[PDB]
A paper describes a structure:
In pseudocyclic proteins, such as TIM barrels, β barrels, and some helical transmembrane channels, a single subunit is repeated in a cyclic pattern, giving rise to a central cavity that can serve as a pocket for ligand binding or enzymatic activity. Inspired by these proteins, we devised a deep-learning-based approach to broadly exploring the space of closed repeat proteins starting from only a specification of the repeat number and length. Biophysical data for 38 structurally diverse pseudocyclic designs produced in Escherichia coli are consistent with the design models, and the three crystal structures we were able to obtain are very close to the designed structures. The large set of pseudocycles with central binding pockets described here combines the diversity of native protein scaffolds with the stability and robustness of de novo-designed proteins, and our RIF docking and Rosetta design calculations suggest that the designed pseudocycles provide better starting scaffolds for small-molecule binder design than do either native structures or previously designed de novo NTF2s.
a–e, Crystal structures of the five-repeat design E8 (a), two-repeat design H12 (b), and the three-repeat design [name] (c–e) are shown as gray cartoons; the loop, sheets, and helix of the design are shown in dark blue, magenta, and teal, respectively. Central pockets in the designs are shown as gray spheres (a–c). The secondary structure interface (d) and the center-water-mediated hydrogen bond network (e) of the refined crystal structure of design [name] are shown using sticks. The electron density map of the interface and the center hydrogen bond network and water are shown as gray mesh. In d and e, the oxygen, nitrogen, and carbon are colored in red, blue, and magenta, respectively; hydrogen bond networks are shown as yellow dashed lines, and water molecules as red spheres. The approach generates a wide variety of structures strongly encoded by their amino acid sequences (as evaluated with RF and AF2, and further indicated by the close agreement between the crystal structures and design models), with between 2 and 7 repeat units (N), repeat lengths of 15 to 78 (L), and all ɑ-, ɑ/β-, and all β-folds.
Author numbering: 1 to 127
Write the structure that this text describes.
């Protein structure tokens, strides 16, 4: 598999191991303010990755968002991953709304604004 961490500069870090990826994301967030992690998700699923590097899969985005809030507090980190098409980037905010981009730095900039507004936002990238 391939797991991708995105930081606040729009840099992409690739990993073969989820626990190492989730640990990098948690560190970039604590040290530099922002990080998302994208993981392979089955079609019609959504996945939340927590601060322990564990996945939580869902078919209902509203339930995923609810869980992502429990996990960010309990484990120190949470990121929602959704399937994206090549050359697209999707931002999911803390209320479950999806915003589509074709420029990663644009997607990151929006995610930062939505994190301020709603408390939480993730950026999903193609795997």
């Amino acid at each position: 598999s391939k797991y991708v961490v995105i930081d606040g500069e729009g840099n992409e870090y690739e990993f073969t191991d989820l626990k190492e990826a989730a640990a990098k994301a948690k560190e970039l967030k604590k040290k530099y303010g922002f990080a998302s992690i994208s993981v392979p998700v089955e079609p019609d699923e959504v996945a939340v990755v927590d601060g322990k590097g564990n996945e939580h899969t869902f078919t209902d985005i509203k339930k995923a968002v609810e869980k992502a809030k429990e996990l960010a507090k309990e484990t120190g980190f949470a990121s929602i991953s959704v399937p994206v098409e090549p050359d697209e980037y999707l931002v999911i905010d803390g209320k479950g709304n999806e915003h589509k981009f074709t420029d990663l730095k644009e997607a990151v900039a929006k995610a930062k604004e939505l994190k301020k507004k709603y408390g939480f936002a993730s950026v999903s990238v193609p795997v």
